[PDB]
Write a protein that binds this ligand. Structure first.
Ligand SMILES: *Cc1c(COP(=O)(O)O)cnc(C)c1O
Ligand SMILES: *Cc1c(COP(=O)(O)O)cnc(C)c1O
Ligand SMILES: *Cc1c(COP(=O)(O)O)cnc(C)c1O
Ligand SMILES: *Cc1c(COP(=O)(O)O)cnc(C)c1O
Ligand SMILES: *Cc1c(COP(=O)(O)O)cnc(C)c1O
Lengths: 267, 266, 267, 266, 266
């Protein structure tokens, strides 16, 4: 199925770090550090909201410049529900669309019908019900929402533990009780049952929102994530290439405390 | 298969199902043209009014009714009481009604009806309940209406609710259906199937408070496929005549002359 | 340990029906029908309460008469917290004490310290926290509370699904989350972990409270119980031996719908 | 002196006090081994149930009981009714029970019991009440329990409350006792005396709902010095046997064989 | 085993643990007689004041402190951040403080401390928290007190709460301990271990607001085994003198003449 092909594309990112980049120079630093993909975005959405503004899809010109600078896949954000922003992003030829709550909400009641696109989408979630609803709408990849613009990992931990905890509950659950469970989740029963059969989400599951240090990134992986997204904090540093490499190594070697010390020491 | 069970219930379209407490009433119902009978040993309202729990009827009385008629026989199981349903299926009857008229046995879960060979009917008050019962395996849906009153107002409410939300689906933007399924707390695939069909994926009967021929024809004109009627038929001085009147009202629901004739002197 | 010996003794009751009996004649009927034990009690505690009374331990004389009439084990009830009633019952020489909410509560804040006794106890529960607290106090066997004096199975179903559901959740839970789980249950962590490793309660678990028909008894067995308690409704009917045998056969043959029809037909 | 009154009540340790309504019941109580009798003319619950005020009993009936027995005689005065207490003392009885079982006479103040030669017993539900009654001059304390029900649950609550707070005092930092006395609204000197003694400075009996031998032995095992029992003893077919059973249960409270014997066939 | 970690922490009894931000402060602390140092790179209050998340310190600065002293070195991990703890253990330090002074990383769960070789300190405000941290594997307990203020009032509250409940538990009726463990939401087996031991089964230090020699001696007289002190030692004129004063106040906590001498002119 077309959906299964999109799911398979996102599976290539397992074990990877996705980095926010604002120009071609940062994109090249991300790729050279070992990032599995880059997220093109023209201004920090928190800065846009600070001075009274609406955070939208970035200019296609800046996205093209990033796409031309790297070989790894390029993602870009569309406002929730803004299906025309997504049509434009797909027409630019990028690899993934992130339907993102970090941009300004465009439709309070509905997300994009992601099955209408060839390009895979990533969507956020805070619990299993949100994850399965985004998947039913066509998301091929899921991330936590975490907490944007703070560097605080606490919300991403909450979201990971919520999704993983309900998946674990679904494993031993009496089949007869799953109907009421799907009702309470407000999630499609068939996807609930698929998750029960697999013992995990039917798409890759990344951590995002507040992943600041190598320790944070390895924590997410030890909790069971398939990878992590990191924001612009990498490039606010004095040595962005070193900071980016440290996150990549933390995700690749998340169960090696000696490696985590090495990449954290003097950072 | 589920489609086989759905096809069995479709044979009842245009029909009246009658509650019967013994073989004599079952024969009267069949002779009047009922499409099926509902075997039940005592009125659950009298059981509760005397401080009691209304359960599955004795298999012996159910078998006596089944032996007395050729038309299908239904019997009730308490909501969630999957062992009562196993017993009813092993009797050899034709349908199980997982019924809120009996005393609730499981406050949080209904029977997993896909585990059975026999088709089930379940009640509903809105489209969300209808689709959840179908996903659990119900092959036939009825309104809950209002039990033990003869007041049609709740059945009208339930029919208008289910039918109204089905009509809302016809022209709904496909992109909005995901949120609609969330708000209904119903499975998206069944919501989309209902949208494609323009009706419920199973037969839809009125039940609960259907008292007169006018009530029965009202339910048919609102779009139901048939009606259930209770023991009030056998409380009158001429049960055969009253049972026939309901049957004729459902068969001829758009014929006011027939409705006058069967109502006159009833 | 002395506790493990009591817990092991109760295993003999698995697959059995325990019947309330008010005299020696009813006790003989219960044994002849195949009951695994009888529960001696002098009057129905609901009718005592309906008479504006206090329901207590039964007269030792009537309990002894039942014990002398049968070979199967005999249980009798003590009020919750009434450790002296339990001392008297133990001195009678019966086999189990049921510390029972069906009698009038004697201590609002504390149950009997059951480890102080040689005789095993059965206690009720409505959820896993109550079950594990009763076990830690020394209960060697657990039953649901269900709903007394009504014949309505709905509360017993609720209690069975609550206990079994939380055990299933616990079985697959992240070990690191079990500490908080024990806190929220207000149950002893060591017993929570023992239950996690076993995948079931550490003691025999019966259904009780509202089990009225063969269908009810087989429902409890199919939900996972080890046996059932039944009340005096057996002896209110016109053929007590037949109704008692029907429940016993329903528990023995709980997965055989043809047998359940046979014993229910004409009952 | 107060210590003399306290010593009088200590003579009752290990004993059962029985409510009696006439001289015959008083003789039965004494022959059964009661340590004292409580003279009272009518059940205050029946007085209140018939819309009435329960007061001090007629001195004439109290004198008849006192003349019939050698063991001490107690009688009740309404809370705050210091003149009822003056009358009872002038009769020549042995103890006054300032009793919430009778109708409250003063909502805000109890009797100043230090003004009397005769010892008083007062009820309590917690350590604060116990120490306040002692400071007013009570030489003996009982739980209030629950009157007229035969339900032991409130007496258990009161015993566990008083005993639990006494146990809290044993290891309490001396510096925290000032605030503890404030929170109890009890006199600090009596709180400190209770801490030094490890128990109440006066004898402590169970009362209110003690119905069976098992109840009486339960109260003794919880640490009480004795029990009061009501008229239920004389409502049975064999009052002498039931009165003896309670006496034996208190004397032999740690002997389950004795408790079985006196309970069997009771 | 856990008992090895518990026994190791007993070596700190009678000691002062000092926050240090560099190797020079660590050497001053050791020379003044500290029993251990707490390495931390910046004040977590200033990090939160400028709108920031306070995390594990850079391993480089922790290593420099560990290489500067012979006494044990502790460092902080965020609550629930088990990977920060894995890194700290791999550095080779002596204790991890799972610390609410850093930004909470997991709102619902603490670190499973039994998974580590290195001992952990955890904070508490009452006996329930202390016993839950111990069951998770804490080998040492401190009060939370109040961070960044120098106000001892919360540490007094926490010490009095823990010690007060242990004193109550010591004398409690065994039959009541089951309900007590339920109300504490603490493991019954650990509650009983604490009852039999008569104190917390691990070392118990005061922390949070210990500002003066008088404060430090107050905590010791209240029953603590030692104290933690913050960077206020090094924010003054003579750090070596201020560090020595706290050490001497803890060693000589019952000597008012010594407390005067170390406080005079401080
Ligand atoms: C995550 C999120 C949602 C999720 O939508 P549901 O239909 O409730 O699953 C909606 N709105 C906002 C603003 C969000 O951030
Ligand atoms: C109709 C009905 C239900 C329906 O169950 P849902 O899971 O909410 O769809 C539940 N309980 C009772 C008593 C009913 O009558
Ligand atoms: C079941 C029950 C309890 C249970 O006691 P916990 O200490 O809360 O576990 C208490 N009281 C009554 C009346 C009960 O029926
Ligand atoms: C027990 C009781 C009291 C106790 O009086 P305090 O001054 O509060 O100790 C008061 N009033 C009534 C009615 C009582 O039963
Ligand atoms: C001390 C503290 C806790 C303690 O956790 P419990 O599981 O309740 O014992 C939790 N959260 C925070 C933020 C704390 O400071």
């Amino acid at each position: 199925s077309p959906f299964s092909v999109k799911v398979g594309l996102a599976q290539m990112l397992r074990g990877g770090v996705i980095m926010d980049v604002v120009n071609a120079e940062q994109a090249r630093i991300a790729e050279e550090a070992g990032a599995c993909a880059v997220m093109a975005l023209e201004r920090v959405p928190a800065d846009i909201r600070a001075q009274g503004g609406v955070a939208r899809m970035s200019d296609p010109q800046m996205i093209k410049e990033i796409k031309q600078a790297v070989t790894i896949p390029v993602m870009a954000k569309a406002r929730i529900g803004h299906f025309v922003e997504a049509q434009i992003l797909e027409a630019i030829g990028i690899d993934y669309i992130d339907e993102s709550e970090v941009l300004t909400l465009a439709d309070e009641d509905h997300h994009i019908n992601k099955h209408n696109f060839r390009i895979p989408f990533v969507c956020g979630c805070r619990n299993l019900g949100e994850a399965l609803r985004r998947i039913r709408e066509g998301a091929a990849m899921i991330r936590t929402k975490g907490e944007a613009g703070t560097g605080n990992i606490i919300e991403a931990v909450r979201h990971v533990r919520s999704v993983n905890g309900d998946i674990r509950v679904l494993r031993n659950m009496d089949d007869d009780e799953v109907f009421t469970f799907a009702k309470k989740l407000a999630a499609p029963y068939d996807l609930v049952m698929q998750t029960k059969q697999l013992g995990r989400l039917p798409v890759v599951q990344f951590a995002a929102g507040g992943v600041a240090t190598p320790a944070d990134a390895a924590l997410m992986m030890q909790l069971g994530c398939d990878g992590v997204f990191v924001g612009s904090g990498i490039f606010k540093s004095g040595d962005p290439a070193r900071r980016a490499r440290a996150i990549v190594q933390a995700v690749t070697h998340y169960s090696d405390p000696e490696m985590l010390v090495e990449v954290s020491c003097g950072l």
